[PDB]
Amino acid sequence: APVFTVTKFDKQGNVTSFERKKTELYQELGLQARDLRFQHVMSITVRNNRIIMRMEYLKAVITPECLLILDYRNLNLEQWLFRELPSQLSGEGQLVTYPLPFEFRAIEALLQYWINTLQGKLSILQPLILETLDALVDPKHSSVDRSKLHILLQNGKSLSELETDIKIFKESILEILDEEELLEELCVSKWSDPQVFEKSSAGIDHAEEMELLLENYYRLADDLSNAARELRVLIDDSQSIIFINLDSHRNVMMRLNLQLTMGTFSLSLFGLMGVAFGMNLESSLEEDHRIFWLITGIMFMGSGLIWRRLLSFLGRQL
Amino acid sequence: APVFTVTKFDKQGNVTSFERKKTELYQELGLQARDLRFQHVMSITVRNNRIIMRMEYLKAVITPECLLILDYRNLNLEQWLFRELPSQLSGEGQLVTYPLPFEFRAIEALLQYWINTLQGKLSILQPLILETLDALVDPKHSSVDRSKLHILLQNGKSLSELETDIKIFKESILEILDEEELLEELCVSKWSDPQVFEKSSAGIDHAEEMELLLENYYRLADDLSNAARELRVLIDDSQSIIFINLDSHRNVMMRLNLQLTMGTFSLSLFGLMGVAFGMNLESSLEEDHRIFWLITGIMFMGSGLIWRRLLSFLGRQL
Amino acid sequence: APVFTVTKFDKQGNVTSFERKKTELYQELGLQARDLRFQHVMSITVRNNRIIMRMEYLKAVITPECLLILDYRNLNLEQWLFRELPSQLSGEGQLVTYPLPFEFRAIEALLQYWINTLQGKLSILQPLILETLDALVDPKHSSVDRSKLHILLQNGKSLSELETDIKIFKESILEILDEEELLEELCVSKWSDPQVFEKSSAGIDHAEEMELLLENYYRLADDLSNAARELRVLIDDSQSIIFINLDSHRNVMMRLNLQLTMGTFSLSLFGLMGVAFGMNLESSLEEDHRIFWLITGIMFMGSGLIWRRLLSFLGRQL
Amino acid sequence: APVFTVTKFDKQGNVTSFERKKTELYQELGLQARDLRFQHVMSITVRNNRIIMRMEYLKAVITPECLLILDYRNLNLEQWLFRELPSQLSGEGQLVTYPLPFEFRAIEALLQYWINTLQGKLSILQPLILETLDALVDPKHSSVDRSKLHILLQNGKSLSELETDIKIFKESILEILDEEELLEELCVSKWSDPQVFEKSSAGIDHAEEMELLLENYYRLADDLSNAARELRVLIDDSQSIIFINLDSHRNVMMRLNLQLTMGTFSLSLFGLMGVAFGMNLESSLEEDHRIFWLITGIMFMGSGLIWRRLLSFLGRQL
Amino acid sequence: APVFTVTKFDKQGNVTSFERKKTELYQELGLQARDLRFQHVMSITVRNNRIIMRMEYLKAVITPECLLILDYRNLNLEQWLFRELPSQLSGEGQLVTYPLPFEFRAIEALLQYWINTLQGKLSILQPLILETLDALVDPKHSSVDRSKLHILLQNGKSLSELETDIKIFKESILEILDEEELLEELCVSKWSDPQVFEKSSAGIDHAEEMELLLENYYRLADDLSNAARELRVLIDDSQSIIFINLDSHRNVMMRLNLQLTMGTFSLSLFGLMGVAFGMNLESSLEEDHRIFWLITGIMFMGSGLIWRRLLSFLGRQL
Ligand SMILES: [Mg+2]
Ligand SMILES: [Mg+2]
Ligand SMILES: [Mg+2]
């Protein structure tokens, strides 16, 4: 029998954690097994006057009088759930002239938590990517640190995953924003209690507030998308600059090797005559006392002359 | 006379396989030859109150009282058709409080089978691509394994084909979702029996359930599209990293070759004087007992001195 | 006086070819010179109850009682026009229970001919591109065949032109599909004879059949677009693989050249002492009978020792 | 006081050029300074029953009874304005059965002039780009002509500017086409004279003719956009082919240099023993008359043997 | 207690700067803390008949009778605010026949200031990018200046940020333009004073003027977007040209090094026989007076012959 771990938050901020089976939870919440499947990483749906919304590892169901967190154990949710969420859900402080229903505060808190996690992911990825790209770009080494290439690849993969997460968050919010029926379905207290909504319709709950809230969070996600796209474009531009760094530095060694090759070729060409005169044969010139010094001087001078003439060749032909 | 191989599933899950001609099948189904052409890899159409839908090798026609599978032989469909489809079509288990008509279950089963095949293709492609890219990226070899390049190319081609398949599946579902007339055409039992629909309109069959089903499968296909796009982006990023791996490692050998070229050039330059003094001529210095050792020491020391001076050159010019 | 070469097909499939001037043709067809300009490669328009449609070299005007082909000479249209089009336009065979008007058959025949030509272009381009990319990708040669690069470039240009042709064909069909007024304008016989349409409105001619026909041809063109896009993506991926093939193979020769450079540098370094002892001077060691063999053995052993020590250098520094 | 140079074309094709101030021109035309600012490169607006439209250097205002060209001096407009525009505006020839108002002819003439200039720019850019890419692609040279790279870069920049111009022209036409109010605003004579329009509504001026005219020019601009996009794709493909041309040809020289390095390494390795036996020491073998020839033969044969063995190495290791 | 620095502009252009707390400012403006959060870089909203709009560092709130600038200190706004904004807000000069309300002038002034700042950013970035790309592209150096690569990278990052800023400015303007309710909300004086609007409805304030103003600024931002996109495309094309510059120049040094390698290989091959005859052994040919000169001539001639034969090899094999 599959089971759910449920953390229930009341309208007063009270936190109660219990242990209830899935089949009993369906009857308690007035839902069916197909509603609480949680097979989508980003989904915000309203089934049977219950707001069922999921963000990766954050699965929550919002009821008119309570908020439930499902499958929260061993997911680093032990700090926010018991020290930040009750404060936001209790309604302490803030503007008391227009207290919105519980579902509005629950949706706002969950959306803010997800936007904060996305902002933290981006603000962790950005400095690492910047510090990795600021070292490979620098033209003070012939090659790049091969150890940092794996770090760059992992950071790029994480950035792609973060971009996908922000894109699906934006799509999920925009789906509710565009369709007026979907946005009106979020008014759980209106349909659950159609007699209090008319009496308390003095700005307490209306489509304008939900429109503004969802637009604010969609704009925050759009800002995050713009920042992530800028970071990815920066990664691509830095890689293109590195491609020029490893090619322009190679040409320097090409030129040095070519110059040394000309030098050693001239040296070998003029030492060829020395080897020819070095054979143990009869050259008919061993009696002369000036031929040796003349040959040595000719060799040494012509080596430099041919080296300079060849050095002019690479300066002429580019 | 062209023929069809038909596998018929009744409302009770009974499986009957027979052998009927195309012309007789058109009369039996009340269709024409143009409807059952199956020239599109992904198409879901409703012609003459019959749901004609095709997924690559899966050609099926859904009738109010039966489901037909056409051209199923020799396509690895001998396990699902006779061991999984009857269980899903029989309606055993699940929620008995709202049994939907047969066409809903048939569409759900076919869509789930195609989404499962796409998920299997993706979950087969992903580990191979990851293990191929994790070996070429590693900077422990001067070159990359040329055998794995063909594997990477074939995996990329398969990923492109899978992306096209998921894209056309999403388009086929979204075409039905967007147009309300197309979605209403799926209610085959409503138009076939317009007198039972009104009596059994207590949540048994309505547009909401089909909207939710098609949205669920479109969202599953969208998740698969996101995963495939992430994999393709990872492939491109890994190829860009390999391009830096094969260029930064080349520069290391460039530097080593340049250093050795400077060393051998200095050695040849200082051995030139040894060759000059090695000729079988009169150098006017053979009588001295210290000129040979002085020349040898000068040669050996100046070789290292010129080598160090040239080694400073590549450290100065980057 | 500009002239037109007209091939006229009657409702009975009769083919009559005559020679009529443009000015007289305008009066005969009830059109103006601006209608029959044919300045667009892909255009399907209905002017003055005449369907004027053009596909590159295929210019045709459809009339209620006849179909005209304009400028057909010397364009390889001498086989289809007189051996395939009359059979399709005669209405022989097929379903006789619902004979559509002549304009429907003419539009279907022209659209099918263009889709067949596009399919032939794609099925000619694909094998050549595949066989060209299967040879350069193979890592059995240091370089790639430079002759096949021009073939690849021409095939890529032809693929781009084919993609543009399919894109404009899809756009032309979708323009008619989206606007209901444009699709209703195709019912030439309805507006020409508003008294037979009502009497023969028993499924003979209605918007459903034209919608299905145009959707079928748009889906065929979409399949061709998907295939062409897959081929282009394959071309790009294969080029990226070749870029790794010509860079990883270069590193192999880099390593071999570096190893040989270390070997020859060690050989020169240890032959330097042999050259130093080879001078025609007084080394004060010519009387010893063991110095020569000791020096030779030291040279030969130290050459290999230094070669191994340098070979360890490239294995340590990657 | 800022001034305007105005060229006025009457309904009879008369050309009058005068010199009027901006402030007086505003009163004469019944406009304000904000209307005649001409700060947009591509804009077609109708302000106060006056069609104010601008195309880069072509600024014109269309009035019910006249057409004005503003700032035409020193812009190579001295041929079209006084030798082509009056002929088109006079209405000579053409179809006299349906003469449209003056504003239609003026808009058609200006749009045709701009489309002709864009076509000329494209037909000038295309041959130069083709002839530049047909020389660098050819694999008959080790390198590419560095002089033609600047020509290619300038042609690419000009192609990008032309693509932007055609894109903004298409956007300007489509803005009028999509909104029916904007298209109806072009009927200047209808609003200026609401009593002649009803009497002369027998096909002289209606929305159909303007729709067809703007659609024709939008389709011409779309054809130009397709051609420019094909040219840009061809440029990118040719650059990718050149990248393979400069890398596959480098590998040929790599292989030749490696082969020569093996040859010279074998030569040095076997000449090491000759240098060792060439020292001026006691080798204890000078008395033998066959050791010298044996050593020389061993050297010469082993040089080739080691060269062949090393040549097998690059054939084994790819 | 958080505080705001407010610069208040009256309808007469008077500038008053004071120091008011956020909580008191909310009561004075009739707003709440959630309205004046300024968490979006580009946002234009109308809350409680107050136009709250922000552009990066420019935060302003527009009231029916005054304009407030918030957080203006130490942001280089001390020149425009006190020397340009009062002149524009005073309404001096211009067309006095149709004076629009204060909110129109304030929105126009703020939008013009932001468009001027964006134009200045673009006109500063463009010359630097052009001068940087005009030096690396030039094929007069083997390598590119590594110092200018960092300048190019920083300029590319700044261009990406500018493109994002212009994109979000265009989106913010288009959001107001598309929705008629949002544009009507900008008429602050209409809702604040619903009795003066009807009396002064003689062209003083209507939707047409705001539509034209927002369209003008959206078109200016679109021109800036086109220019920035052209600059980015130019950057990419120039980088692609540099990639050919550093590869075609490398091949020149490849060819020179190969030619010198052939020369030195021929020299070593023919000096091998000189070394063989140079050994201190019995060659049985020392008595001949012509063998030495013959060997030397053969060596010198065959060196050049083999060099030419090898030079033909690279001319044959490309
Ligand atoms: Mg080398
Ligand atoms: Mg050497
Ligand atoms: Mg000697």
JSON list of C-alpha atoms in Angstrom, two decimals, chain A residues 136-244:
[
{"chain": "A", "resi": 136, "resn": "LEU", "atom": "CA", "xyz": [41.02, 30.14, -20.09]},
{"chain": "A", "resi": 137, "resn": "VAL", "atom": "CA", "xyz": [40.47, 33.40, -21.99]},
{"chain": "A", "resi": 138, "resn": "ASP", "atom": "CA", "xyz": [43.63, 35.00, -20.56]},
{"chain": "A", "resi": 139, "resn": "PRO", "atom": "CA", "xyz": [46.44, 34.82, -23.18]},
{"chain": "A", "resi": 140, "resn": "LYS", "atom": "CA", "xyz": [49.29, 34.09, -20.75]},
{"chain": "A", "resi": 141, "resn": "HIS", "atom": "CA", "xyz": [49.60, 30.35, -21.47]},
{"chain": "A", "resi": 142, "resn": "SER", "atom": "CA", "xyz": [50.15, 28.35, -24.65]},
{"chain": "A", "resi": 143, "resn": "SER", "atom": "CA", "xyz": [47.41, 25.88, -23.67]},
{"chain": "A", "resi": 144, "resn": "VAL", "atom": "CA", "xyz": [44.40, 25.95, -21.36]},
{"chain": "A", "resi": 145, "resn": "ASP", "atom": "CA", "xyz": [44.02, 24.11, -18.06]},
{"chain": "A", "resi": 146, "resn": "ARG", "atom": "CA", "xyz": [42.50, 20.76, -19.02]},
{"chain": "A", "resi": 147, "resn": "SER", "atom": "CA", "xyz": [41.16, 20.29, -15.48]},
{"chain": "A", "resi": 148, "resn": "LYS", "atom": "CA", "xyz": [38.90, 23.35, -15.79]},
{"chain": "A", "resi": 149, "resn": "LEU", "atom": "CA", "xyz": [37.39, 22.13, -19.07]},
{"chain": "A", "resi": 150, "resn": "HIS", "atom": "CA", "xyz": [35.40, 19.47, -17.19]},
{"chain": "A", "resi": 151, "resn": "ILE", "atom": "CA", "xyz": [34.24, 22.13, -14.71]},
{"chain": "A", "resi": 152, "resn": "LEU", "atom": "CA", "xyz": [33.11, 24.29, -17.63]},
{"chain": "A", "resi": 153, "resn": "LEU", "atom": "CA", "xyz": [31.25, 21.35, -19.20]},
{"chain": "A", "resi": 154, "resn": "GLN", "atom": "CA", "xyz": [29.46, 20.50, -15.95]},
{"chain": "A", "resi": 155, "resn": "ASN", "atom": "CA", "xyz": [28.57, 24.16, -15.41]},
{"chain": "A", "resi": 156, "resn": "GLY", "atom": "CA", "xyz": [27.18, 24.36, -18.94]},
{"chain": "A", "resi": 157, "resn": "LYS", "atom": "CA", "xyz": [25.06, 21.26, -18.37]},
{"chain": "A", "resi": 158, "resn": "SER", "atom": "CA", "xyz": [23.76, 22.71, -15.10]},
{"chain": "A", "resi": 159, "resn": "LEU", "atom": "CA", "xyz": [23.01, 26.00, -16.87]},
{"chain": "A", "resi": 160, "resn": "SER", "atom": "CA", "xyz": [21.05, 24.15, -19.56]},
{"chain": "A", "resi": 161, "resn": "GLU", "atom": "CA", "xyz": [19.04, 22.32, -16.89]},
{"chain": "A", "resi": 162, "resn": "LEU", "atom": "CA", "xyz": [18.39, 25.60, -15.05]},
{"chain": "A", "resi": 163, "resn": "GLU", "atom": "CA", "xyz": [17.26, 27.24, -18.30]},
{"chain": "A", "resi": 164, "resn": "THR", "atom": "CA", "xyz": [14.84, 24.37, -18.89]},
{"chain": "A", "resi": 165, "resn": "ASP", "atom": "CA", "xyz": [13.50, 24.68, -15.34]},
{"chain": "A", "resi": 166, "resn": "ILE", "atom": "CA", "xyz": [12.92, 28.43, -15.69]},
{"chain": "A", "resi": 167, "resn": "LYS", "atom": "CA", "xyz": [11.33, 27.92, -19.12]},
{"chain": "A", "resi": 168, "resn": "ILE", "atom": "CA", "xyz": [8.85, 25.35, -17.81]},
{"chain": "A", "resi": 169, "resn": "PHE", "atom": "CA", "xyz": [8.10, 27.54, -14.77]},
{"chain": "A", "resi": 170, "resn": "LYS", "atom": "CA", "xyz": [7.34, 30.45, -17.11]},
{"chain": "A", "resi": 171, "resn": "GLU", "atom": "CA", "xyz": [5.17, 28.21, -19.29]},
{"chain": "A", "resi": 172, "resn": "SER", "atom": "CA", "xyz": [3.24, 26.92, -16.27]},
{"chain": "A", "resi": 173, "resn": "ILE", "atom": "CA", "xyz": [2.55, 30.45, -15.02]},
{"chain": "A", "resi": 174, "resn": "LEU", "atom": "CA", "xyz": [1.67, 31.76, -18.50]},
{"chain": "A", "resi": 175, "resn": "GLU", "atom": "CA", "xyz": [-0.81, 28.92, -19.08]},
{"chain": "A", "resi": 176, "resn": "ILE", "atom": "CA", "xyz": [-2.79, 30.11, -16.05]},
{"chain": "A", "resi": 177, "resn": "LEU", "atom": "CA", "xyz": [-2.34, 33.78, -16.97]},
{"chain": "A", "resi": 178, "resn": "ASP", "atom": "CA", "xyz": [-3.57, 33.48, -20.56]},
{"chain": "A", "resi": 179, "resn": "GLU", "atom": "CA", "xyz": [-6.77, 31.49, -19.92]},
{"chain": "A", "resi": 180, "resn": "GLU", "atom": "CA", "xyz": [-9.25, 33.35, -17.72]},
{"chain": "A", "resi": 181, "resn": "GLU", "atom": "CA", "xyz": [-11.01, 30.09, -16.80]},
{"chain": "A", "resi": 182, "resn": "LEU", "atom": "CA", "xyz": [-7.80, 28.62, -15.37]},
{"chain": "A", "resi": 183, "resn": "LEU", "atom": "CA", "xyz": [-7.14, 31.78, -13.35]},
{"chain": "A", "resi": 184, "resn": "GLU", "atom": "CA", "xyz": [-10.73, 31.82, -12.06]},
{"chain": "A", "resi": 185, "resn": "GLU", "atom": "CA", "xyz": [-10.35, 28.17, -11.01]},
{"chain": "A", "resi": 186, "resn": "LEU", "atom": "CA", "xyz": [-7.68, 29.31, -8.53]},
{"chain": "A", "resi": 187, "resn": "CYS", "atom": "CA", "xyz": [-10.41, 31.04, -6.50]},
{"chain": "A", "resi": 188, "resn": "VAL", "atom": "CA", "xyz": [-10.99, 27.92, -4.41]},
{"chain": "A", "resi": 189, "resn": "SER", "atom": "CA", "xyz": [-12.77, 29.76, -1.59]},
{"chain": "A", "resi": 190, "resn": "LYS", "atom": "CA", "xyz": [-15.19, 31.33, -4.09]},
{"chain": "A", "resi": 191, "resn": "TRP", "atom": "CA", "xyz": [-16.50, 28.01, -5.39]},
{"chain": "A", "resi": 192, "resn": "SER", "atom": "CA", "xyz": [-16.28, 26.24, -2.02]},
{"chain": "A", "resi": 193, "resn": "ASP", "atom": "CA", "xyz": [-18.18, 29.06, -0.26]},
{"chain": "A", "resi": 194, "resn": "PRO", "atom": "CA", "xyz": [-20.29, 30.95, -2.83]},
{"chain": "A", "resi": 195, "resn": "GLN", "atom": "CA", "xyz": [-22.11, 32.84, -0.05]},
{"chain": "A", "resi": 196, "resn": "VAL", "atom": "CA", "xyz": [-19.14, 34.52, 1.68]},
{"chain": "A", "resi": 197, "resn": "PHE", "atom": "CA", "xyz": [-17.49, 35.65, -1.56]},
{"chain": "A", "resi": 198, "resn": "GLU", "atom": "CA", "xyz": [-20.31, 38.07, -2.44]},
{"chain": "A", "resi": 199, "resn": "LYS", "atom": "CA", "xyz": [-20.42, 39.53, 1.08]},
{"chain": "A", "resi": 200, "resn": "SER", "atom": "CA", "xyz": [-16.61, 39.85, 1.27]},
{"chain": "A", "resi": 201, "resn": "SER", "atom": "CA", "xyz": [-16.16, 41.12, -2.30]},
{"chain": "A", "resi": 202, "resn": "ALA", "atom": "CA", "xyz": [-14.78, 44.48, -1.08]},
{"chain": "A", "resi": 203, "resn": "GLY", "atom": "CA", "xyz": [-11.36, 43.91, -2.61]},
{"chain": "A", "resi": 204, "resn": "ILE", "atom": "CA", "xyz": [-10.58, 40.86, -0.46]},
{"chain": "A", "resi": 205, "resn": "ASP", "atom": "CA", "xyz": [-10.46, 38.41, -3.38]},
{"chain": "A", "resi": 206, "resn": "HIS", "atom": "CA", "xyz": [-10.76, 39.21, -7.09]},
{"chain": "A", "resi": 207, "resn": "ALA", "atom": "CA", "xyz": [-9.06, 38.42, -10.39]},
{"chain": "A", "resi": 208, "resn": "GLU", "atom": "CA", "xyz": [-6.92, 41.58, -10.27]},
{"chain": "A", "resi": 209, "resn": "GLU", "atom": "CA", "xyz": [-4.82, 40.44, -7.30]},
{"chain": "A", "resi": 210, "resn": "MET", "atom": "CA", "xyz": [-4.14, 36.99, -8.75]},
{"chain": "A", "resi": 211, "resn": "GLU", "atom": "CA", "xyz": [-3.34, 38.54, -12.14]},
{"chain": "A", "resi": 212, "resn": "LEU", "atom": "CA", "xyz": [-0.81, 40.87, -10.50]},
{"chain": "A", "resi": 213, "resn": "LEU", "atom": "CA", "xyz": [0.73, 38.08, -8.41]},
{"chain": "A", "resi": 214, "resn": "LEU", "atom": "CA", "xyz": [1.17, 35.69, -11.34]},
{"chain": "A", "resi": 215, "resn": "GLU", "atom": "CA", "xyz": [2.47, 38.54, -13.52]},
{"chain": "A", "resi": 216, "resn": "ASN", "atom": "CA", "xyz": [5.02, 39.47, -10.85]},
{"chain": "A", "resi": 217, "resn": "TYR", "atom": "CA", "xyz": [6.31, 35.91, -10.62]},
{"chain": "A", "resi": 218, "resn": "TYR", "atom": "CA", "xyz": [6.30, 35.47, -14.41]},
{"chain": "A", "resi": 219, "resn": "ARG", "atom": "CA", "xyz": [8.34, 38.68, -14.71]},
{"chain": "A", "resi": 220, "resn": "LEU", "atom": "CA", "xyz": [10.80, 37.44, -12.08]},
{"chain": "A", "resi": 221, "resn": "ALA", "atom": "CA", "xyz": [11.17, 34.19, -14.03]},
{"chain": "A", "resi": 222, "resn": "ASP", "atom": "CA", "xyz": [11.62, 36.22, -17.23]},
{"chain": "A", "resi": 223, "resn": "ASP", "atom": "CA", "xyz": [14.42, 38.21, -15.58]},
{"chain": "A", "resi": 224, "resn": "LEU", "atom": "CA", "xyz": [16.06, 34.92, -14.59]},
{"chain": "A", "resi": 225, "resn": "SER", "atom": "CA", "xyz": [15.65, 33.63, -18.16]},
{"chain": "A", "resi": 226, "resn": "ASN", "atom": "CA", "xyz": [17.31, 36.77, -19.53]},
{"chain": "A", "resi": 227, "resn": "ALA", "atom": "CA", "xyz": [20.22, 36.41, -17.10]},
{"chain": "A", "resi": 228, "resn": "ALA", "atom": "CA", "xyz": [20.69, 32.73, -17.96]},
{"chain": "A", "resi": 229, "resn": "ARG", "atom": "CA", "xyz": [20.57, 33.45, -21.70]},
{"chain": "A", "resi": 230, "resn": "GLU", "atom": "CA", "xyz": [23.16, 36.20, -21.26]},
{"chain": "A", "resi": 231, "resn": "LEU", "atom": "CA", "xyz": [25.37, 33.76, -19.35]},
{"chain": "A", "resi": 232, "resn": "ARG", "atom": "CA", "xyz": [25.04, 31.13, -22.09]},
{"chain": "A", "resi": 233, "resn": "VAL", "atom": "CA", "xyz": [25.85, 33.70, -24.79]},
{"chain": "A", "resi": 234, "resn": "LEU", "atom": "CA", "xyz": [28.88, 34.74, -22.72]},
{"chain": "A", "resi": 235, "resn": "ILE", "atom": "CA", "xyz": [29.98, 31.09, -22.53]},
{"chain": "A", "resi": 236, "resn": "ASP", "atom": "CA", "xyz": [29.73, 30.74, -26.31]},
{"chain": "A", "resi": 237, "resn": "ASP", "atom": "CA", "xyz": [31.59, 34.01, -26.94]},
{"chain": "A", "resi": 238, "resn": "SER", "atom": "CA", "xyz": [34.35, 33.04, -24.49]},
{"chain": "A", "resi": 239, "resn": "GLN", "atom": "CA", "xyz": [34.73, 29.65, -26.20]},
{"chain": "A", "resi": 240, "resn": "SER", "atom": "CA", "xyz": [35.02, 31.43, -29.55]},
{"chain": "A", "resi": 241, "resn": "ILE", "atom": "CA", "xyz": [37.71, 33.69, -28.06]},
{"chain": "A", "resi": 242, "resn": "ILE", "atom": "CA", "xyz": [39.60, 30.67, -26.68]},
{"chain": "A", "resi": 243, "resn": "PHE", "atom": "CA", "xyz": [39.49, 29.16, -30.18]},
{"chain": "A", "resi": 244, "resn": "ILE", "atom": "CA", "xyz": [41.38, 32.24, -31.41]}
]
